[PDB]
Symmetry: D2
Subunit: 88 residues, 4 copies
């Protein structure tokens, strides 16, 4: 009960909080969930020309120590791990 | 009473040995199952989640983002 | 001066390179249609999402991101499954 | 009889590393900060052998496709999930 399951971490992400695994080899990495922005477009955010442009759905990002943001690919250990926590 | 499950519940189902699937999946006859370390076997195997596809093949599963966020999970019965 | 198609098969590697040249790719085996991958660079994503301009120390910037457009007219970040990666039924969106 | 070839210092894309993995060789990204890590592929028949399942005698029996594993730094073998930078990277190399 000290650290969480991936499922609980999912729930925290879905609430809008950031989440990370202590097991991760490093610091200042964490996940966050960008909810669907329909304003995001190839023609610049908020300046979409076509009404049926595809909409970005939810995306989970991983922010790395490089201060970079990538789309997160959940690894099998990540989804089975039990060392998830909230960043604060 | 809840009508379908989150991925976390599905994982618990998986950890019990059961097969799970998403209703939103395009394919039919498709599900996940968890193989424990010991049956897999100083490198020590971990658990591996497998996806079985309609083509009757089995691959290591790479969880998609939609999959992880979805709530249309179910037990294969 | 224009080439000719020698082979049906395309591996992920060839698909990848095409993606990095800013081109779109998809798999014949996929269940569904009008599904394809694309790649967005750091700068293209700053412009598309309206965030990640790098004017602040300690403000993160987008890396390169591969997306998948699904039939729902939705975009999600692309998870490279073992099957996708090993497949050799890739084709360029033309 | 056979002269030795030179190592050139060039590193390759994931596409190339995959073909190598499909030739049965092991690979690894330099960019991974850890050591003693590598991918390896296991083919369908080697997998039916090594778990004892899926030799094709039954119709509705399933066969293990190809599988990329990764031996970790911690001496664990797991099914490998490629990160996106993994996929886009060009610091891949063959294990010698």
């Amino acid at each position: 009960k000290t650290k969480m399951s991936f499922g609980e971490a999912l729930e925290v992400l879905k609430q809008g909080m950031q989440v990370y695994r202590s097991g991760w080899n490093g610091k200042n990495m964490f996940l966050f969930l960008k909810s669907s922005d329909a304003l995001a477009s190839d023609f610049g955010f908020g300046f979409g020309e076509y009404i049926n442009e595809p909409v970005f759905g939810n995306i989970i990002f991983i922010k790395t120590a490089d201060n970079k943001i990538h789309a997160w690919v959940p690894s099998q250990t990540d989804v089975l791990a039990e060392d998830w926590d909230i960043v604060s």
